[PDB]
Amino acid sequence: SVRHGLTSAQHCVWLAQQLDPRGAHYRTGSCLEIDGPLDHAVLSRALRLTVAGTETLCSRFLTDEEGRPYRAYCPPAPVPYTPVLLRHIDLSGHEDPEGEAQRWMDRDRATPLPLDRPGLSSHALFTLGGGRHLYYLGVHHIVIDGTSMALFYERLAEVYRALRDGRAVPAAAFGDTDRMVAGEEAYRASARYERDRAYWTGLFTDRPEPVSLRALAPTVRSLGLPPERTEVLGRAAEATGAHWARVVIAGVAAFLHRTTGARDVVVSVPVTGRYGANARITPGMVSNRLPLRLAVRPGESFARVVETVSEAMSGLLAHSRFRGEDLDRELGGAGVSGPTVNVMPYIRPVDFGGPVGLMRSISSGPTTDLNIVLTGTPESGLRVDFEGNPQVYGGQDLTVLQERFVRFLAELAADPAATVDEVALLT
Ligand SMILES: *CCCCNC(=O)[C@H](C)N
Numbered sequence: 001s002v003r004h005g006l007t008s009a010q011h012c013v014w015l016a017q018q019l020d021p022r023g024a025h026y027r028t029g030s031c032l033e034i035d036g037p038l039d040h041a042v043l044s045r046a047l048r049l050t051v052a053g054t055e056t057l058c059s060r061f062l063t064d065e066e067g068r069p070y071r072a073y074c075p076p077a078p079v080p081y082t083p084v085l086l087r088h089i090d091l092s093g094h095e096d097p098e099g100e101a102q103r104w105m106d107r108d109r110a111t112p113l114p115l116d117r118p119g120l121s122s123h124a125l126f127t128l129g130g131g132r133h134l135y136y137l138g139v140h141h142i143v144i145d146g147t148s149m150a151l152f153y154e155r156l157a158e159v160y161r162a163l164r165d166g167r168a169v170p171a172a173a174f175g176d177t178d179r180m181v182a183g184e185e186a187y188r189a190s191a192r193y194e195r196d197r198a199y200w201t202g203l204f205t206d207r208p209e210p211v212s213l214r215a216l217a218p219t220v221r222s223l224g225l226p227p228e229r230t231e232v233l234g235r236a237a238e239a240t241g242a243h244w245a246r247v248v249i250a251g252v253a254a255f256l257h258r259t260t261g262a263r264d265v266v267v268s269v270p271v272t273g274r275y276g277a278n279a280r281i282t283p284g285m286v287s288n289r290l291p292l293r294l295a296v297r298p299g300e301s302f303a304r305v306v307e308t309v310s311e312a313m314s315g316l317l318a319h320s321r322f323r324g325e326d327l328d329r330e331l332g333g334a335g336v337s338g339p340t341v342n343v344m345p346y347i348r349p350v351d352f353g354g355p356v357g358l359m360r361s362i363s364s365g366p367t368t369d370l371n372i373v374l375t376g377t378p379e380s381g382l383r384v385d386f387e388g389n390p391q392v393y394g395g396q397d398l399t400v401l402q403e404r405f406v407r408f409l410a411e412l413a414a415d416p417a418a419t420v421d422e423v424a425l426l427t
C-alpha cells in the first residue's frame with residue numbers, strides 16, 4: 001500500500017511514455033556474451049532470487065487521484081506478484097545463432113511493457129553452440145539504467161555461483177530507493193538548485209538549436225574494434241593526461257567541427273545521477289543527461305580540444321544535479337543537445353564460476369538524433385554502437401558514419417599535437 005516517490009529520471013520517462021502510451025520507445029537492453037556452458041535450471045532459480053532482492057525489478061507504476069505517478073512494490077510469489085521468467089532459447093544447431101539471437105532481442109525490444117504490470121523486464125538465455133551463451137536483459141528504462149544493468153549482472157552471477165557450489169546464497173547488498181529519492185528532494189529544496197539553474201541557463205542564453213549530421217527507439221549499428229585499433233586511445237590519454245573517455249568526447253567534438261565547420265559544437269553527456277554510497281548501489285533509473293558546449297577555434301590542436309573538453313566537463317560535473325530535462329523545459333522548444341556520447345564505465349567480466357560474461361549494449365535509449373555508445377577499454381578493445389533515430393538515419397548510413405568517425409578518432413589520437421583543421425577527414 002506504500003506509495004513510493006519516483007526519481008527525477010523516472011518522472012522524466014513516465015511523462016515521455018504518456019506521449020505515446022502504447023509505444024515501446026523506452027524499451028532498452030543489453031546482454032552478456034558468455035564463453036562457456038550455464039545450467040538454465042539453476043540460472044532460472046538464480047534469476048528468481050535476484051529479482052526478489054531487487055526492488056526496482058519488482059515495481060509497477062500507478063497514478064493517484066490527482067493523476068500523479070507513484071511506484072508500488074510487488075514481491076514475487078513464494079496485489080499482483082512480480083512474475084519471473086528466464087527463457088531458454090537453444091540456437092545450437094542454427095546456421096547463424098548470433099544473428100537469430102539479435103533478431104529475437106530486437107523483436108522483444110519492440111514489445112510494449114505496460115507500466116501498471118509489475119516486473120518490467122524480459123530475460124532470455126541463448127545457447128549459441130560451441131558451448132557459448134548469451135544472456136539478454138530487456139527492460140523498461142523507467143526501472144533500470146546503465147549502472148543498474150551492471151549491478152544486476154553481478155548479483156545474478158553471485159547467486160548462480162552459490163547455487164552451483166552448494167554454498168549458501170550471500171545476502172544481497174543493494175541500497176534503498178526511498179532514501180535516494182529523498183536525497184533528490186533535498187537537493188531541489190536547497191540553495192544549490194538555484195545556483196545550478198543559473199549556471200545552466202546562463203550557458204545557453206543564445207539557445208542553440210540541436211543539429212544533426214521526436215525521440216524514437218534507435219536503429220543500432222555496432223562495430224567491434226580490437227585492441228590493435230583501440231590501444232592508441234590509451235596512449236593519447238597517457239600523453240594528454242586526460243582520462244580516455246575525455247579523449248573520445250574530444251574526438252566526437254573534433255569530428256562534428258571538421259564535418260560541419262561549426263565553431264561551437266554541442267554533445268550530450270550522461271552522468272549516473274548517483275550521489276553517495278547508498279545511491280551508488282541502488283538498482284533503478286536515476287541517470288541524467290547534460291549538454292557539453294565546446295568551442296573549437298581555428299588552428300587548435302587535438303590536445304587543445306581535449307583541454308577544452310576538460311574545462312567544460314569540470315563545470316558540468318560541478319552542477320551535475322540539475323536535470324537535463326528541466327534545463328530544456330526552461331529554455332523551451334527542442335531544448336539543447338547534441339549526439340549523446342556514452343562512454344560506459346569499466347565493468348569487470350561477469351564470473352559465473354568458470355564461464356565469463358562480457359557485457360554489450362543492445363539499446364541504450366530512444367533518441368531524436370544519435371547516441372554514440374562505447375563499451376570496453378582501450379586495452380581490451382571496444383564495441384562502438386551508433387544508435388540513430390530511424391527517421392534521420394538508415395542502417396547503412398550509420399555504418400558509414402561510424403566507420404568514418406572511428407578512422408578520424410584514431411588519427412587524432414595517434415598525434416594529439418596535430419592541428420585539427422589540418423587532419424584529413426576522409427569520407
Ligand atoms: C529524461 C530521462 C529519460 C532519458 N534517459 C535516457 O534515455 C538515457 C540517456 N539513456
Ligand SMILES: [Cl-]
Nearest residue numbers: 145146147287
Ligand atoms: Cl541510462
